[PDB]
């Protein structure tokens, strides 16, 4: 079973990539749960993570650098909800595009990735319940997972990737 993200326009098969990281925003305000969404920032947030490869992408790092042994999370200031949280994976997650308007990701591999991310965030914020929620909104490039490939620019709705609760 897989997670099938709608994309426009249709990414061709040679644009399938390896998700190597992602960038999150921690929701503000105040239940002992901590909520994360794909970043509400912009290109400055993405560049300062310093784990991207050559592909320009939002929300997810494609074909970037991998951590050595386990997931690593970093932030310029954990107490500032306006600073994004950089998540660098240790084993990549493949995202295969069919050329028909969708790119697919294994549900079990994505769930196991989110569990490791949740665990690292749990140790950083000393919480108990980590909740991933969809983008709060924004321009098409940032509310979607967007990325360039072969001179073309593609937009994939990512709401299915960020919708889980982890204890």
């Amino acid at each position, epitope marked *: 079973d897989t997670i099938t993200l709608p994309c426009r326009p249709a990414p061709p098969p040679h644009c399938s990539s390896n998700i190597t990281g992602l960038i999150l925003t921690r*929701q*503000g305000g105040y239940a002992n749960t901590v909520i994360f969404r794909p970043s509400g920032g*912009d290109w400055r947030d993405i560049a300062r993570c310093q784990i991207a490869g050559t592909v320009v992408s939002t929300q997810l790092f494609l074909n970037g650098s991998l951590a050595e042994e386990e997931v690593v999370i970093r932030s310029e200031d954990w107490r500032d*909800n*306006a600073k994004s949280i950089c998540v660098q994976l240790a084993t990549s997650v493949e995202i295969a595009c069919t050329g028909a308007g969708h790119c697919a990701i294994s549900r079990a591999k994505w769930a196991n990735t989110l569990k490791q991310i949740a665990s690292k965030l749990r140790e950083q914020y000393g919480a108990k319940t980590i909740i991933f929620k969809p983008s709060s909104g924004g321009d098409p490039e*940032f509310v979607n997972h967007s990325f360039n490939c072969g001179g073309e620019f593609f937009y994939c709705a990512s709401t299915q990737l960020f919708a889980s609760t982890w204890f």
Partner: antibody
Amino acid sequence: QVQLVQSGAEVKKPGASVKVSCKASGYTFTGYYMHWVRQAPGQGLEWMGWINPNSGGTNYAQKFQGRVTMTRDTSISTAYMELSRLRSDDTAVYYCAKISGSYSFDYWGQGTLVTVSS
Amino acid sequence: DIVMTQSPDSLAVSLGERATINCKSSQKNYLAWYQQKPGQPPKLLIYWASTRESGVPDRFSGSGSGTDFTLTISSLQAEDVAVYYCQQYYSFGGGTKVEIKR
């Protein structure tokens, strides 16, 4: 000179929505986050959320998630705060405020009084 | 997700005397202090806990580190009557209303 000019006072019925605007001049509008803060009469300052004017990304206070929407029109350097499903205890002065590099609010709008009443 | 509490809620100070406002966090220090008068937005007085904004008179000073911070008005003038707020990241303290003691 930096100035944030907000729209005029509004009287709304409970259950309606209000949209407050905040027009910025004197600085690069997309270079600094805009925050919204409200103040019920006689009470303190309550943070509502921020918007990144460059991308339109937002981060709302959990209290207002699903009720507030923050947008901006960069061609006219104007930020907007829409609050829907109004209750009487949303009666407050609503401020836009521009964060600085020292993470303080050096410039504020003059405030927009929103009165919710039947 | 950090709560800033201010004490007291209200402070009566005799003219020309010292006023001390406390701000404590519940968990470089990014504390800022604001002064609010009726019908106006808050006005920034101090940032980085102790740096005075341009134009702010020398009788205003901030200090503190870590968890406890203080705004001091060394010699209260009538024009200093107002509500004062501290701020760390995007949490504000509850406000301290400063009035003249007679």
